[PDB]
Design a protein around this motif. Structure first.
Motif, PDB file in Angstrom:
ATOM      1  N   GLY G  53     -14.606  19.010   9.869  1.00  0.00           N
ATOM      2  CA  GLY G  53     -15.365  18.552  11.011  1.00  0.00           C
ATOM      3  C   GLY G  53     -15.642  17.065  11.050  1.00  0.00           C
ATOM      4  N   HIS G  54     -15.364  16.339   9.970  1.00  0.00           N
ATOM      5  CA  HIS G  54     -15.557  14.898   9.937  1.00  0.00           C
ATOM      6  C   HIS G  54     -14.498  14.292   9.025  1.00  0.00           C
ATOM      7  CE1 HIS G  54     -17.591  15.209   5.970  1.00  0.00           C
ATOM      8  NE2 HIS G  54     -18.058  16.339   6.471  1.00  0.00           N
ATOM      9  N   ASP G  55     -14.516  12.965   8.918  1.00  0.00           N
ATOM     10  CA  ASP G  55     -13.539  12.236   8.111  1.00  0.00           C
ATOM     11  C   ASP G  55     -13.953  12.140   6.649  1.00  0.00           C
ATOM     12  OD1 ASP G  55     -11.265  10.881   7.492  1.00  0.00           O
ATOM     13  OD2 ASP G  55     -11.720   9.081   8.664  1.00  0.00           O
ATOM     14  N   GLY G  56     -14.477  13.224   6.082  1.00  0.00           N
ATOM     15  CA  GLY G  56     -14.855  13.214   4.687  1.00  0.00           C
ATOM     16  C   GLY G  56     -13.655  13.125   3.764  1.00  0.00           C
ATOM     17  N   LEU G  57     -13.933  12.765   2.515  1.00  0.00           N
ATOM     18  CA  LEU G  57     -12.869  12.577   1.538  1.00  0.00           C
ATOM     19  C   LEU G  57     -12.234  13.909   1.159  1.00  0.00           C
ATOM     20  CD1 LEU G  57     -14.452   9.900  -0.837  1.00  0.00           C
ATOM     21  CD2 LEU G  57     -12.545   9.579   0.751  1.00  0.00           C
ATOM     22  N   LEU G  58     -10.907  13.916   1.094  1.00  0.00           N
ATOM     23  CA  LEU G  58     -10.141  15.036   0.572  1.00  0.00           C
ATOM     24  C   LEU G  58      -9.516  14.640  -0.759  1.00  0.00           C
ATOM     25  CD1 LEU G  58      -8.387  16.382   3.806  1.00  0.00           C
ATOM     26  CD2 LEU G  58     -10.511  17.159   2.731  1.00  0.00           C
ATOM     27  N   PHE G  59      -9.262  15.636  -1.603  1.00  0.00           N
ATOM     28  CA  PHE G  59      -8.784  15.399  -2.959  1.00  0.00           C
ATOM     29  C   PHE G  59      -7.621  16.329  -3.267  1.00  0.00           C
ATOM     30  CE2 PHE G  59     -12.044  12.513  -4.549  1.00  0.00           C
ATOM     31  CZ  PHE G  59     -13.050  12.694  -3.621  1.00  0.00           C
ATOM     32  N   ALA G  60      -6.509  15.749  -3.721  1.00  0.00           N
ATOM     33  CA  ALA G  60      -5.322  16.497  -4.111  1.00  0.00           C
ATOM     34  C   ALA G  60      -4.801  15.944  -5.428  1.00  0.00           C
ATOM     35  CB  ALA G  60      -4.227  16.430  -3.038  1.00  0.00           C
ATOM     36  N   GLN G  61      -4.210  16.822  -6.234  1.00  0.00           N
ATOM     37  CA  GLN G  61      -3.813  16.500  -7.597  1.00  0.00           C
ATOM     38  C   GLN G  61      -2.298  16.531  -7.738  1.00  0.00           C
ATOM     39  OE1 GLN G  61      -6.051  18.562 -10.606  1.00  0.00           O
ATOM     40  NE2 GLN G  61      -4.549  18.176 -12.230  1.00  0.00           N
ATOM     41  N   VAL G  62      -1.771  15.626  -8.565  1.00  0.00           N
ATOM     42  CA  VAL G  62      -0.347  15.592  -8.879  1.00  0.00           C
ATOM     43  C   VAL G  62      -0.028  16.724  -9.847  1.00  0.00           C
ATOM     44  CG1 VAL G  62      -0.216  13.116  -8.469  1.00  0.00           C
ATOM     45  CG2 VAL G  62      -0.659  13.976 -10.781  1.00  0.00           C
ATOM     46  N   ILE G  63       1.260  16.970 -10.081  1.00  0.00           N
ATOM     47  CA  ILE G  63       1.679  18.060 -10.958  1.00  0.00           C
ATOM     48  C   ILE G  63       2.694  17.632 -12.000  1.00  0.00           C
ATOM     49  CG2 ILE G  63       1.105  19.982  -9.433  1.00  0.00           C
ATOM     50  CD1 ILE G  63       3.801  19.813  -8.202  1.00  0.00           C
ATOM     51  N   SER G  64       3.354  16.489 -11.844  1.00  0.00           N
ATOM     52  CA  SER G  64       4.379  16.082 -12.789  1.00  0.00           C
ATOM     53  C   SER G  64       3.749  15.665 -14.115  1.00  0.00           C
ATOM     54  CB  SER G  64       5.214  14.940 -12.215  1.00  0.00           C
ATOM     55  OG  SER G  64       6.203  14.525 -13.144  1.00  0.00           O
ATOM     56  N   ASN G  65       4.608  15.466 -15.114  1.00  0.00           N
ATOM     57  CA  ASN G  65       4.183  15.065 -16.445  1.00  0.00           C
ATOM     58  C   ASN G  65       4.492  13.611 -16.771  1.00  0.00           C
ATOM     59  OD1 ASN G  65       3.152  17.590 -16.989  1.00  0.00           O
ATOM     60  ND2 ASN G  65       4.347  17.912 -18.862  1.00  0.00           N
ATOM     61  N   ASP G  66       5.249  12.911 -15.931  1.00  0.00           N
ATOM     62  CA  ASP G  66       5.608  11.524 -16.174  1.00  0.00           C
ATOM     63  C   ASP G  66       4.951  10.624 -15.137  1.00  0.00           C
ATOM     64  OD1 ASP G  66       8.014  13.392 -16.931  1.00  0.00           O
ATOM     65  OD2 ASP G  66       8.205  11.645 -18.249  1.00  0.00           O
ATOM     66  N   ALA G  67       4.657   9.389 -15.550  1.00  0.00           N
ATOM     67  CA  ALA G  67       3.932   8.463 -14.686  1.00  0.00           C
ATOM     68  C   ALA G  67       4.758   8.075 -13.465  1.00  0.00           C
ATOM     69  CB  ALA G  67       3.529   7.221 -15.477  1.00  0.00           C
ATOM     70  N   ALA G  68       6.041   7.763 -13.669  1.00  0.00           N
ATOM     71  CA  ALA G  68       6.890   7.351 -12.555  1.00  0.00           C
ATOM     72  C   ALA G  68       6.966   8.424 -11.478  1.00  0.00           C
ATOM     73  CB  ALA G  68       8.291   7.003 -13.058  1.00  0.00           C
ATOM     74  N   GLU G  69       6.843   9.694 -11.862  1.00  0.00           N
ATOM     75  CA  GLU G  69       6.814  10.777 -10.890  1.00  0.00           C
ATOM     76  C   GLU G  69       5.420  11.041 -10.340  1.00  0.00           C
ATOM     77  OE1 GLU G  69       8.310  12.789  -9.029  1.00  0.00           O
ATOM     78  OE2 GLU G  69      10.362  12.132  -9.439  1.00  0.00           O
ATOM     79  N   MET G  70       4.376  10.810 -11.141  1.00  0.00           N
ATOM     80  CA  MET G  70       3.015  10.921 -10.625  1.00  0.00           C
ATOM     81  C   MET G  70       2.772   9.918  -9.505  1.00  0.00           C
ATOM     82  SD  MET G  70       0.704  11.486 -14.045  1.00  0.00           S
ATOM     83  CE  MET G  70       0.620  13.053 -14.906  1.00  0.00           C
ATOM     84  N   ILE G  71       3.354   8.723  -9.623  1.00  0.00           N
ATOM     85  CA  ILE G  71       3.186   7.703  -8.593  1.00  0.00           C
ATOM     86  C   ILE G  71       3.840   8.145  -7.291  1.00  0.00           C
ATOM     87  CG2 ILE G  71       3.644   5.301  -7.999  1.00  0.00           C
ATOM     88  CD1 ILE G  71       3.657   4.714 -11.029  1.00  0.00           C
ATOM     89  N   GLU G  72       5.048   8.711  -7.374  1.00  0.00           N
ATOM     90  CA  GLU G  72       5.731   9.178  -6.172  1.00  0.00           C
ATOM     91  C   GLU G  72       4.967  10.321  -5.514  1.00  0.00           C
ATOM     92  OE1 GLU G  72       8.812   7.545  -5.151  1.00  0.00           O
ATOM     93  OE2 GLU G  72       7.817   6.221  -6.593  1.00  0.00           O
TER      94      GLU G  72
END
Lengths: 222, 222, 222, 224, 221, 222, 222, 224, 221
Positions: G53-72
């Motif tokens: 109902g408003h522009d509140g913050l949403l939160f989603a988590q990565v799943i990979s194990n490597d940093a270069a893939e977490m960034i993507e």
């Protein structure tokens, strides 16, 4: 021995109702409560023993301001019923009556205690119990529990034959705090005793227990 | 006596699995837990005794709201198995049943306790145990451990025949805190018991131990 | 009895050196330390017994992952020397072996303890000692002394036949804190034991004493 | 009971012992190489004099000097033979712990001196020492936790080596002495200069003067 | 029951207080005795009579040298039975305490301002030590803390000696001393007369009898 | 400013590896650490600056015992790299060098601090940082954190230009306690920095996360 | 601003129900909760935004194990909805991604925090929030609130641009304790949110109010 | 400054309000369905009378009765129109939190009543309530942590919902009232029977009698 | 510097104390004034003169009804400049405090035995409230705790009112009040005369000059 919760009333019917489901140890009275029922002491005291159902302690208070007259009234009250402890206000004339009644078969309680000083003096004078007015101390100086704690600690060190008898309560937290800081027992008013057990959480837990039981067994049988 | 960790379930398979590697003292049930298995009490109680492997205490709870019916249900539950303690909710009618069952061989537990007031009254009425709902108290008033610590001290001072039986847990620290503030024993849900020893640091330490043992001896022999 | 300071090593020469001036109660081992010495257990254990100089307790740890094999390894370890206690990791399989080894002549110790939950479960299962890894707990959660203190209380209250055996130390204050919060005894690595008495202030005071004694008597004689 | 053996005097001066023991409840005399060197009198001579000056059969304390454990044992036997009821003080280091180990079970009771932390005192107690003496004021100088060290040490001995008690030493004021006796010390040893000033309290002298000034004003003299 | 002592030389005040208070005995000091200016060999038998029982009586020496303190202690002890002689804890007082220890003359170490003189007096043979609580509060502000430390020090190291609280100005100082380890206390007469008069108790008592008259008629029971 | 976690090593490879995944603020060295690598300071300091990747502070320590020589060595160390702070032991000669270097651009750190006395004197003498040896103090007197907390409060009150720089650590909780009691920054050994994030519970939680993600999506794609 | 209570769920209907009467600040997700709904992230995130109902913050988590893939994965998640913060597990690879994502428009949260060490390292690395698993810490070491309290202090002193985001809760007191010891905000599971206001005492008081109002005015009108 | 708006009286009796406000610094009047039902006077009539009896433009508090959120909003608008400076009391449950949410931003300020734990008070503050009123004595009856609940709630609001303050309610003695005002309460409401006995202190009457007894003895009369 | 007030009507004691003590002003009560038995309209100008500066003076009403308290407050306020009228905190006293608030007659709420009457007096308009510390210690034993709670309650809810410590028997009560939130204190003259006489200071001073004579000859510098 389980003699912990006393009821502060003069109404016989309230005693018969409360003792039917509460572990009531006995009945305590004071001139104000006894005046409310407007019944003479030599008649209501036998009715309170019968209403209690067991050989619990009864407490009655003198009314005269003279020590020699307190001693006369203490002997008459002791003969009105069995297992009665005479309540004596802790003042100058009160300590004289406690002193004279020491050693005899008339056990005394030092009532109207507002500070640890009068409670300790009554215990040294020969009183078996001293009764601080917890809620009245909270009204006057805001240290009801601290006074009970100090008094109980002083009696255990210097007059162990005297125990603290908590009185004058308005909620359960006051009652439990006194029992936790050194009180041997407490006396609670009738209105507090009837409101002790009503916990809406317990009623909501039972109705959910019975709802699950019916869904799995189709009845309330076991 | 080693009778400390009780399990709160009616699932026979969960009792057999946990007691094979954990020092389980007994089994506790409530109407919601028993309804989850939906097997009648006169049948499931002998099965839980067999699954336990020893003569540990068993706990069953009454269902009715009437005091006279609770006493009848308590006597029937006591006859289903041996070493069974009847769980009774600490309300007005429940305190009647605890008062009537005092003196009999039907040991009672005061359950559905949300404050130290009802727990103390249950102990004075003749109950052998009192079970506060730690996690439910944390929900309603946020003083679960404080309620347990106060109730344990009050019983040790004024009703020593009654002990605190911790119940309603959601994590390990709630269990350890109860046992640390004066609980005699605790009963935990099955899902929590399966997750207690689950510690990834221990598995890493055990793996590192045998890994270093292979590098020096080429085998896992001793 | 003076059985407080144990040493965690498999080096036989280090035991002979440290026992020459320290009140060493015994020697504890683990698979990682035993792997460094690269000596079989049936040979090093009789060597450590002779190096200790008395019949102090020795400690050896199993390596298998299953209970039925931990029991067999515990029996062979118990037969290598006298007065040996078997160390068992406190996991699901380790608690099965402690359960089965309870009542036998083989005394057990619960090792790899990272929290009071597994320490209490091992004590209730029949373990004579439980060994928290103090420094490893400080690394993961930072409450090593608090964990030892809580575990020592829980055992004293609910499993008094089991004591806390402090392990995994990096400085003297960790050791002393454990002994102050309820540890029956402690084991320290050899590097810590050689650095315990290292205090430059003590050496500076002894040099000052000899300096003043040479200035007055012209010698170090007395 | 108590026994009364609580206040010890740390000196080698015979005259000070006689003066202080005449009116103070002194339990015995303790010495160390620095204190004994000031008197410049050999130990086989000063120890009999201190026993005579003490006036009773209280405990005397003397310390070894050598660094070698075998030489400490020889010095401990010679000191134990100079007077009766003498306890040998041994520094709590590696070589000193060897001497304490060898002297246990014998008739030579030992004290663990030069204690700067609770680790030394605990090891000495487990080794066989009857007393351990932390230098309170020196610990305060180095790490500022003299009383805390004494309290921890006394608690560790009560739980793990009950045959060893703490013997407070190195004091500069009355507050340090009373704190040690309150946190677990069995007894204390105080320097002579401290013992001479223990009772100095001008408030007491003022109260006494007021008491007799009121007595003279009402009765005329100081007669009772 | 030997807990509350009265610090006075007024025989009349003792007779009044003992009629309703559990008085254990009577203590005196040079200032309190000199105010009444009654000679000790006469007032002490009067105090014994006025007390009504054989409780302990306390009297203090006045000289400065230990030799005369002993002479005064022997005379005081002979004036009445069950008298304990108070001696100030200084160097000369410690000599007199030591000289009297082992005889039938028991002593109390008075004029105690710190725990050091209290402990030395106990080790020297004094049966009691009496710190001046209110006077310590005046000079260093730690009267109760001094009593607490002294009581614990005696319990550990000189158990034959106990702390005797003195010099009070309100009821709270007295109760604090009895809570932190005092065996007994002595209170001035003016304080003892003001211990029981509590206006709340009087108002509560009059309210009780006011309700009793309204329901029955008079103070009949 | 994010300049909190310093690394205590002279190994270039360890600086590159740690700074790639950790917020490293700079590099600290002492004669023992620098001797372990055994590469001259005028050569290794430029290498540590390059390996750090940013202009963070570098710390080198003097060697001589003479105050005049320490000043000469401090000026040479300051010229080897940029943003270097000279570490000086807080003794009598070292306090001369700190006094002489006050006012100059050669910022100094008071190292080898074992009590709050020498730390306070170093701050008043003109030192920008003071470094107590927490683990060595825990060895000698067992009050490492208390010494740090007192020294930090003393500086904040009487020498605010000087800050406490935590050093000598053996576990994570020592590091966090120092930063919690008033430390401005900490320097940790390399072996500890490699073990900080090592938490088996985190690995188990991450594994369980992606394991549940496979069961629902059949892949590790998002 | 009122952005304190977040909800941890992927059920779009539950968000619409709870936001109808609760001041919900936003919705947080994790791979395990997202796997239960079995809905792709590019679809459920716009649904949760409209459900909020408003522009509140949403939160989603990565799943990979490597940093270069977490960034993507963090870049694609940031492009699914507006006002989304990427959750990253605080390990060796996670700190690399937070380091690289620092300075960009993608704000990050450090999740899977079990101790204050990784919480502080994530904050110093550039993370806007760190999320300790309170109940999971209570399970493993029993110091969840103590860990949150320590972490909140460390961030306030040394990394004030990072706040503590309380997560993993089982009762109301855990949530309130976290907000009292320094949590900027909290996220609770949906089952807890539906049970927050459950208080039988409140319902019993409202029923008593309506009972007295009907006895006087004969109606529920006003 | 302070403003002086601290002591509120919990009653619907017009006569008691007039008597107490004449000599006590009363800030306003609070009501609840049980208290208002005792007077048996409709709210549109008693609220103007209470405003007149108060003597100033202090805040008045009235509570809704319905269980439905939409009906609570309608009842809140009618109560807000009965008198000026009226704050509507709404029970903190699921339906009550809907009304507080809908009434935020409007000219109708709300109070969250029937608060038994800090979770209710925090949610109501975040929902838009200006005040939250925990029942102190009722919490003491049920869980024995009334003051602790007030202290936690006041701390949670100061940190997370600063526009909402705690309003202490349900008191039986002066100590409960003072504790709440000391642990974070902005103001309190007390029953009439408590307000009449607040100043009852026989020690004060005794001191006054002694002052004038000394004055008569020295001057003959009570003239000054 | 307006911290230490003297509770007396003795003009001579004020002149002596002000010669060496930083006295802020003089407070009176009916008992203290009646002891000297000097009329208020004469002694108050004498106290102003003896004080030496324009510090605050305090005088207390005596009647029971609020109407006469107002008449007495107006007369007292007119006897000297800078006078604050003390009013006992009861129901009638609260009426007089309310009636005087908003006028040039500032008030102090005296005879305070608990924090309840102190807070009500502050909310009613009193500039000060004065608990009887030693009298509270006598009746309930929580004098300092009452002062501490009252000071915090006023700082939060009635910041125009401050706590004025009164009724003392030793220096430690006075210093405790000034530490727990009192703005100022009033002490009896006997206490003020016993504040500075410290035997340790006198002994330390005489030891200084004794060493000075031995090294130089006399007290020359």
């Amino acid at each position: 021995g389980g003699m912990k919760i006393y009821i502060d009333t003069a109404d016989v019917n309230e005693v018969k109702t409360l003792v039917s489901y509460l572990p009531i140890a006995g009945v305590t009275t004071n001139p104000t409560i006894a005046a409310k029922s407007a019944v003479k002491m030599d008649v209501v005291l036998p009715q309170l023993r019968e209403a209690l159902g067991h050989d619990g302690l009864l407490f009655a208070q003198v009314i005269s301001n003279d020590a020699a007259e307190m001693i006369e009234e203490a002997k008459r009250l002791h003969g009105y019923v069995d297992n009665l402890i005479v309540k004596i206000p802790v003042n100058k004339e009160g300590l004289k009556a406690i002193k004279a009644l020491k050693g005899t078969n008339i056990r005394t309680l030092g009532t109207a205690v507002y500070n640890a000083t009068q409670g300790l003096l009554a215990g040294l004078a020969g009183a078996e119990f001293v009764a601080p007015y917890v809620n009245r101390i909270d009204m006057l100086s805001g240290n009801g529990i601290q006074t009970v704690q100090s008094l109980a600690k002083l009696l255990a060190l210097h007059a162990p034959h005297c125990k603290v008898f908590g009185a004058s309560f308005k909620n359960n937290q006051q009652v439990l705090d006194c029992l936790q800081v050194g009180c041997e027992c407490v006396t609670i008013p009738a209105d507090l005793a009837f409101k002790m057990l009503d916990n809406p959480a317990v009623d909501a837990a039972v109705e959910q227990f019975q709802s699950d039981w019916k869904a799995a067994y189709g009845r309330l049988d076991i």
